[PDB]
Amino acid sequence: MNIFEMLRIDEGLRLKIYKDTEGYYTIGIGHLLTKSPSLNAAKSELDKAIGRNTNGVITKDEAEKLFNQDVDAAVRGILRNAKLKPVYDSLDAVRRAAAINMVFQMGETGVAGFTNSLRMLQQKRWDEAAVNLAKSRWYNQTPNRAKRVITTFRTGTWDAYK
Ligand SMILES: [Cl-]
Ligand SMILES: [Cl-]
Ligand SMILES: [Xe]
Ligand SMILES: [Xe]
Ligand SMILES: [Xe]
């Protein structure tokens, strides 16, 4: 298991524009297109992202391409953030994958706000972090996904994904 397979499982793969759990237009492997309610705005952001007139549909390769870009951006966002990087560098490989998933999902600012959990993770207080991480809107809105990520930070193993 790795970050890619992990996110492919949590996000799924959809070749046509769809709405995510918050109702925003998305495509591929969780590639958010726009927060706007306008489908045309979404079609325009998609065409710009792909480089062609897609008419709201892309191929598997195009999806995987956007996915690679998005994972890369997520890692880079963590490294660039002064509140995230030190935590991230303190973690083992498995746990780092969990941090990437969260950022991919809610953004760097979003994760940078889990101050208290950040500190517990840095201190390697796994069970405590786990409990604090569940006290969030993220967990109440996508509890199955949040449980899998939480267990991963908790245990340092990929068990929740097997
Ligand atoms: Cl893009
Ligand atoms: Cl979920
Ligand atoms: Xe992190
Ligand atoms: Xe994190
Ligand atoms: Xe976190």
Curated annotation (Swiss-Prot):
- Which residues take part in binding substrate? L32, F104, S117, N132
Chief location: host cell
Q: What is the effect of changing E11N?
A: Loss of 84% of enzymatic activity
The entry's cellular-component GO terms read: host cell cytoplasm
- What SUPFAM superfamilies would the database entry show? Lysozyme-like (SSF53955)
Group of enzyme by EC: hydrolase
Induction remarks: Expressed late in the viral replication.
Instruction: Supply the InterPro entries for this chain.
Output: Endolysin_T4_type, Glyco_hydro_24, Lysozyme-like_dom_sf, Lysozyme_dom_sf, Phage_lysozyme-like, T4-type_lysozyme
Q: Where in the cell is it found?
A: Host cytoplasm
UniProt keywords (A-Z) are: Antimicrobial, Bacteriolytic enzyme, Cytolysis, Glycosidase, Host cell lysis by virus, Host cytoplasm, Hydrolase, Viral release from host cell
Q: Decide whether keyword Hydrolase is in the record.
A: yes
Query: Which CDD domains did the record assign?
Result: T4-like_lys (cd00735)
- UniProt-reported outcome of changing G30F: Almost complete loss of enzymatic activity. The enzyme is destabilized by 1.5 kcal/mol
Reaction(s) catalysed (UniProt annotation): Hydrolysis of (1->4)-beta-linkages between N-acetylmuramic acid and N-acetyl-D-glucosamine residues in a peptidoglycan and between N-acetyl-D-glucosamine residues in chitodextrins
EC number, UniProt record? 3.2.1.17
* Described function: Endolysin with lysozyme activity that degrades host peptidoglycans and participates with the holin and spanin proteins in the sequential events which lead to the programmed host cell lysis releasing the mature viral particles. Once the holin has permeabilized the host cell membrane, the endolysin can reach the periplasm and break down the peptidoglycan layer.
* Name of this protein: Endolysin
User: Gene symbol?
Assistant: E
